[PDB]
Amino acid sequence: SMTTPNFELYGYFRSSCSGRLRIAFHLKSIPYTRHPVNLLNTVPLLVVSNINNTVSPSSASFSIGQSLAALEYLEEALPTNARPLLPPISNPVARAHVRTICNIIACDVQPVTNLKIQKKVKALDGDPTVWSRDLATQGFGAVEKLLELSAGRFCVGDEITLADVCLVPAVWAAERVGMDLARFPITKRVFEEMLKEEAVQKAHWQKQEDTPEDLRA
Amino acid sequence: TPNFELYGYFRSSCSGRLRIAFHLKSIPYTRHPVNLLKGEQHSDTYKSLNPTNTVPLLVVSNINNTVSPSSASFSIGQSLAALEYLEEALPTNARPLLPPISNPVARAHVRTICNIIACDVQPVTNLKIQKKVKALDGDPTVWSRDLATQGFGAVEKLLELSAGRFCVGDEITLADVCLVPAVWAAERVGMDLARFPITKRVFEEMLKEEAVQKAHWQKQEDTPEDLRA
């Protein structure tokens, strides 16, 4: 097998969904072409080429506009990669726990606290910051109860999984609306352990090419 | 103890996904209806079933729980995780709902469709967010209709690339299982399904399936008499 997928990521330094993929690519040492897209229509968007597109066979590339599907694609399309981000298939219970945590974040927090929805909330004369902070706080409470069951060094045991990959950019996004991370001690410990990772530092929202100077670290 | 217990509600779209998947795969389960309109998920009987109190809740029993080994059960409060769990925990089931592992591109396409519904539509148009919108003095029905119309436009674009008889090719996948209750939820808020011709056709093809009829929101033990059909 001589199959070598080519990856290009249309992303944004501050997008929490783009940050999942940045983290996942660095942890797995998978080279990608970064195409920054300044949001101030889908971001992120991962374009995979040099593959068999079994959906659109005459097409050179295959697009994935949803970060969770893009993450699972990385797990499935690269079976020889030295770092799986899921427990193995023979452990469906641990995989379900990992996916539960990803879904609380990807389904219960991110979609109700993004720019699009904050704007809809301001259109109803609400306070988008308060709306987002209360929803993030509630979602992190559910994350924390699941981490009480599974966390070791990381969200699920002592290895990094997709759960930690989702957790990190969601902490960045939650802190921006003033959520107090200290309310969720296992989440906080796992977050900090993840920031010790060089791959997480390379994926950092303050450390990308399109990070504005005011925001750089 | 049953292998599977679904605490569901007849008109919950996430519960609908699970009912459809169980019928499609002929997997026996025990149904406990929890009336979300009466706030029954806060009652004492459902106390010890944490999460906090989510509907649907899938309780899985008689298993080796490799996360909490002192227990022979676990519960899953996220329908997407629960759907994937059925695929992996029952690998020899007569109806797999994802294309095989040797076609990761088609599994990615299926997951993308599920994610649009499960991430971009259902969370912003569910009962919790509608109540929040109502408290702002907005119209929750209009809010949800706009958001579902927008999500369906993105689904329809993906179906243009993949759909045959069903969402992805000619076989039922998890994309179809997510689509059906999403169409039910969207129509409930006045979305015009005819604007999305591929979605409409796939939805009508799914409604030909007896399993979908057994999972139908109008055909559950807890469907009120005036909503039955």
Numbering used by the authors:
A (entry chain B): 0 to 39, 55 to 231
B (entry chain A): 3 to 231
Text from the published report:
Crystal structures are presented for a putative uncharacterized protein that shares sequence similarity with ζ-class glutathione S-transferases (GSTs) in both apo and glutathione-bound forms. Each protomer consists of an N-­terminal βαβαββα thioredoxin-like fold common to all GSTs as well as a C-­terminal α-helical domain. Based on sequence homology, structural similarity, half-site glutathione binding and sulfate ion H-site binding, the protein investigated here is likely to be a ζ-class GST/MAAI. Glutathione S-transferases (GSTs) are detoxifying enzymes that appear across a wide range of aerobic organisms, including bacteria, fungi, plants and mammals.
The 2.2 Å resolution apo structure contains two pseudosymmetrically related dimers in the asymmetric unit. The apo structure reveals a nonsymmetric homodimer with each protomer comprising two subdomains: a C-terminal helical domain and an N-terminal thioredoxin-like domain that is common to all GSTs. The C. immitis protein exhibits a nonsymmetrical dimer in which one protomer has several more ordered residues than the other; residues 39–52 are dis­ordered in the second protomer. These residues correspond to the cap of the active site and coordinate glutathione in the G-site (see below). All four chains in the asymmetric unit contain a sulfate molecule that binds to the backbone N atom and side-chain hydroxyl of Ser15 as well as the side chain of Gln124 and forms water-mediated interactions with several additional residues. A sulfate ion is observed in approximately the same orientation off Ser15 as in the H-site of the human ζ-class GST crystal structure and is believed to simulate the expected binding of the substrate dichloro­acetic acid. The equivalent Arg190 in the C. immitis structure resides in a different rotomer conformation without forming interactions with the sulfate ion (which is approximately 4.8 Å away in each protomer); it is involved in salt-bridge interactions within the crystal lattice.
